[PDB]
Amino acid sequence: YKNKLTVCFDDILKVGAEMMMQQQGFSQSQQKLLKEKVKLFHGILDDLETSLSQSSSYLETLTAL
């Protein structure tokens, strides 16, 4: 998960790199690539939050037991 968060913010600039390259209209492929990148970033953030919550709950239950 440590590498995923780094690459995702590196890739959102990488995905845009070709977007401003043509800028340097918009292609639908690049727009949908950006959309899926941002939605997967949100999804992995949610997954990491759920994993943290589950690990925490395991922490209290093992400490109690």
Partner: protein, 111 residues
């Protein structure tokens, strides 16, 4: 009708200059996506390279070799290479310099 001819010639020169610009930029600052993003975005705005700020420091070996004024003489093959390229490129004090060779006015790059 020299006006339209010179406009189209300037446009072709601009597009080839932009081509050389990004092909050089993608390799000079490959290690810093932030620097590449901000540099290309500022040049899309039309900011001179002498005003914008850099977060990272480039090595001095490329600076010494690109000019050759140091102890090592520039290669004659390197001289031919920099002659055939359309952009005069050199770095002064951790910052490169970019100047148009045909139009000396303030060429606005803004969209």
């Amino acid at each position: 009708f020299r006006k339209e001819e010179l406009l189209l010639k300037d446009l072709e020169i601009r597009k080839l200059e932009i081509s050389s610009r990004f092909k050089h930029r993608q390799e000079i600052f490959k290690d810093s996506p932030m620097d590449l993003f901000m540099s290309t975005l500022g040049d899309c705005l039309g900011i001179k390279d002498e005003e914008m700020l850099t977060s990272c420091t480039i090595p001095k070996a490329v600076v010494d070799h690109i000019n050759g004024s140091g102890k090592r003489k520039p290669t004659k093959a390197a001289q031919r290479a920099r002659d055939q390229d359309s952009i005069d490129i050199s770095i002064k004090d951790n910052k490169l310099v970019m100047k148009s060779k045909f139009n000396k006015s303030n060429r606005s790059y803004s969209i």
